[PDB]
């Protein structure tokens, strides 16, 4: 899975998400990457988000739609990704699962070009390229 979101010179957003999925998955298994609202969601009036990790969990919480609605409600891309991750955390707990077994990350961008990210566990980085250049950044994570 590689998810990519961008804001162009016209001030327009778009995104793409593509994967070969979870290695050795059951035949016919589908994760979040092709599901709008789960692996990817773009609203030109608000922002965009894409998710990666254990697809089942992103589908379960309709993750990117959540991240974008949070930005719609006033959160910065960063805060939105964080609050979204925290929802998967509460749910993982409600389902009696162990957070160590799950990995979910979100990266987001709003109409102003501000961006952010957050993930359940350490280890995930994302790349960001703007006029200042291209860089690899590491977001905060919930499982400390």
């Amino acid at each position: 899975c590689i998810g990519m979101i961008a804001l162009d010179a016209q001030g327009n957003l778009s995104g793409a998400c593509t994967t070969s999925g979870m290695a050795y998955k059951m035949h016919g298994r589908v994760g979040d990457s092709p599901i709008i609202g789960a692996g990817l969601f773009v609203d030109n009036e608000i922002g965009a988000a894409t998710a990666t990790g254990h697809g089942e969990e992103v589908i379960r919480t309709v993750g990117t739609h959540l991240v974008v609605e949070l930005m719609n409600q006033g959160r910065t891309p960063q805060q939105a990704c964080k609050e979204a991750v925290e929802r998967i955390v509460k749910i993982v707990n409600r389902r009696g699962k162990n957070l160590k077994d799950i990995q979910v990350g979100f990266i987001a961008l709003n109409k102003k070009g501000e961006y952010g990210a957050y993930c359940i566990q350490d280890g995930f980085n994302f790349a960001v390229h703007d006029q200042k250049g291209n860089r690899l950044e590491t977001p905060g994570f919930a499982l400390k």
């Binding site: 899975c1 590689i2 998810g3 990519m4 979101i5 961008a6 804001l7 162009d8 010179a9 016209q10 001030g11 327009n12 778009s14 995104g15 793409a16 998400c17 593509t18 994967t19 070969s20 999925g21 290695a23 050795y24 998955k25 059951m26 035949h27 016919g28 298994r29 589908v30 994760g31 990457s33 092709p34 599901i35 709008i36 692996g39 990817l40 773009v42 609203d43 030109n44 965009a48 894409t50 990666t52 990350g105 990266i107 987001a108 961008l109 109409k111 102003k112 070009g113 961006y115 995930f124 980085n125 994302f126 790349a127 960001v128 390229h129 703007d130 006029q131 291209n134 860089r135 690899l136």
Partner: protein, 142 residues
Amino acid sequence: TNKPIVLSTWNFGLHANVEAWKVLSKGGKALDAVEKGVRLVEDDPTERSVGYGGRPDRDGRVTLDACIMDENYNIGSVACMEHIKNPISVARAVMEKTPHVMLVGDGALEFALSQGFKKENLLTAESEKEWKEWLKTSQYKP
């Protein structure tokens, strides 16, 4: 406003961003930039979680999932599609060339072939080798 700007997941996103930037820096559409950007990874047989070279399902079949969304709620998606190296572009065609927004399985391949995409063997020697080793440790019978 900080623009143009592009974000992508994982370490290989750095190299993918460079491709997207070739479009973004010349004033091109976000839609074109993100498609070009991820196609780079899909084309790369050494990036085993995307496109060509992707690790197969437990039966040894490489099946791909992808979706795309533009600046005006247009969407396209393909899931569990075989033999097509660039599912992101088939998703784009689903979006632009059909009244539907998601095609899966055999139907997704048929559509891709109809749009001129070429059927290919996405299973590499490396992925096949690893798959078989997994069969040994997992003991699953395909």
